[PDB]
């Protein structure tokens, strides 16, 4: 029932009729519509007219929510999204002062701080627009007011928690706002409201703990302004947070939120939390399970049965790896990584909270393998993972087999440390980790052939991590590796002879010859695979 044709129009009045009749659910389609729709729907004139109408309707708002205003503000911030990401769209200079007028009218309405889920739905779009439109400098007092007014009754409503949590995005987005950064150093009331909000113990273990954690995080960010008049209050607030909550335990999301941003701009000794990561690693990964003399597990909260299933599957994968890769069990030169440490958090949330501090890693992924330096006697490589309900039984450790194969590949196939290759090896490393662990069980790899968008071997081999194209890296890396093992296993060993000796130019010439010689066969092979 959402027809985007109605937005492809030149009359402001029909546009708003489309907004009000089709509603927020259909306006939502403007974020992903073709540029033809977006250029028509998001002209400077349309945006000025919608903003002025929204302004008058918001002035008349009498509480209880508004499907029309929710849709209007969504359209307005949808426009800033399209203008940012569509080069065919650039707003004239009078567009934003009007959008600010439309926002101001909702903010100055006597019902702005109303409670309730219906009000939260329009309020959410208004608070997001403040960020989308680059208006963070204009609503600092709104942040302070919501932080000061928040209570348990606002906290009853899912849509109020979601809406008001947007005030923290405003502080985050203001970093790129020159007006904001000239003003923020004076906002002592906001700093006081932020620390009071995060130090409220009733938020711990509650549905608003995540807002208190975001409060702490945004306060830690203000540690940047070392010479600003807010700096004593910021320091005092961070010090209070670090003293009231544990780095592991109830409320540690608030502790770790503050530590994350504050450690980026202030020394640990400023808050006397130097070396907290050692104690945290021991609290968070408190279990020890010894699989063998070459694999040990440190984990947050696995059962003995899970520990046993992980050790057994890794012993199984090891054997299958060496047979399949024909290693002779002989590692590459200059590699002393006989022992491995496996680190398993209780959930992706736990991984997201603790692994960054403990291991220094990015956690926007499904796990991580850290080979270290194999030439250093005493180096212990680590992989870091989390339990997931959708992981493999019986261990339910997400990417257990995948990361383990990274260790095996790194020790038996790929000379040097992780950064050593001078030619791209992403397709191989990720493809062999997927193929050795999944073999022929990869529905998503079949599906990405069936959808009609494909890659050539040459494109697969030139895959990088840039933009983390999971489809290209993991599915098409898997497909090329599986194809070469099934159809040209002698060529695979020839390639491995180059990689095992760190002969990267020779490796690249080998696989570029494949990309010329085998492309038609690969094309027929993927076709047969997609058929059945």
């Amino acid at each position: 029932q959402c027809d985007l044709s109605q937005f492809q129009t030149t009359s402001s009045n029909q546009l708003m009729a489309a907004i009000r009749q089709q509603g927020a659910s259909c306006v939502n389609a403007l974020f992903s519509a073709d540029t033809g729709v977006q250029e028509a729907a998001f002209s400077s004139n349309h945006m000025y007219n919608v903003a002025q109408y929204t302004r008058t309707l918001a002035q008349q708002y009498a509480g209880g929510g508004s499907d029309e205003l929710e849709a209007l503000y969504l359209y307005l911030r949808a426009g800033y999204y399209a203008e940012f990401y569509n080069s065919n769209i650039t707003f004239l200079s009078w567009v934003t002062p009007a959008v600010k007028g439309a926002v101001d009218a909702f903010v100055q309405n006597a019902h702005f701080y109303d409670n309730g889920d219906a009000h939260g739905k329009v309020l959410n779009e208004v608070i997001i627009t403040m960020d989308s439109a680059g208006l963070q400098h204009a609503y600092l007092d709104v942040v302070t007011q919501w932080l000061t007014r928040w209570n348990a009754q606002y906290a009853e409503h899912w849509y109020m928690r979601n809406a008001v949590n947007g005030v923290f995005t405003l502080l985050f987005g203001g970093q790129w706002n020159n007006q904001y950064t000239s003003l923020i150093g004076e906002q002592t009331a906001l700093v006081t409201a932020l620390q009071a909000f995060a130090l409220d113990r009733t938020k711990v273990n509650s549905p608003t703990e995540f807002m208190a954690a975001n409060a702490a995080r945004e306060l830690g960010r203000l540690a940047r302004y070392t010479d600003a008049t807010i700096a004593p209050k910021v320091t005092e607030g961070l010090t209070a947070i670090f003293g009231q909550y544990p780095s592991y335990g109830d409320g540690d999301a608030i502790w770790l939120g503050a530590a994350d941003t504050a450690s980026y701009y202030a020394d640990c000794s400023q808050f006397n939390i130097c070396g907290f990561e050692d104690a945290l690693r021991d609290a968070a990964l408190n279990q020890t399970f010894i699989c063998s003399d070459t694999i040990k597990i440190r984990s947050q909260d696995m059962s003995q049965a899970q520990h046993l299933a992980a050790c057994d599957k890794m012993a199984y994968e090891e054997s299958f790896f060496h047979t399949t890769l024909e290693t002779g069990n002989q590692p590459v030169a200059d590699d002393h990584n006989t022992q491995l440490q496996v680190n398993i958090f209780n959930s992706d949330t736990d991984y997201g909270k603790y692994a960054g501090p403990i291991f220094g890693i990015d956690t926007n992924n499904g796990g991580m393998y850290l080979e270290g330096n194999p030439a250093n006697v005493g180096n212990i490589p680590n992989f870091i993972a989390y339990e997931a309900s959708y992981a493999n039984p019986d261990h339910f450790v997400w990417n257990l087999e995948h990361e383990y194969v990274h260790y095996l590949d790194g020790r038996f196939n790929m000379y040097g440390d992780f950064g050593t290759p001078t030619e791209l090896v992403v397709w191989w490393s990720e493809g062999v980790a997927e193929y050795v662990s999944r073999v022929n069980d990869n529905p998503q790899a079949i599906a990405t052939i069936q959808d009609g968008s494909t890659y050539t071997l040459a494109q697969v081999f030139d895959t990088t991590y840039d933009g983390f194209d999971v489809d290209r890296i993991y599915r098409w890396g898997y497909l090329a590796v599986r194809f070469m093992f099934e159809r040209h296993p002698d060529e695979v060993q020839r390639m491995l002879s180059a990689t095992r000796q760190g002969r990267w130019a020779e490796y690249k010439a080998i696989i570029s010859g494949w990309a010329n010689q085998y492309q038609s066969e690969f094309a027929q092979w993927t076709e047969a695979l997609a058929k059945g």
Binding site: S32, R77, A78, Y80, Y81, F84, Y85, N124, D131
Partner: peptide, 6 residues
């Protein structure tokens, strides 16, 4: 970049 859809 600006916030995406809800």
């Amino acid at each position: 970049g600006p916030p995406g859809p809800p």
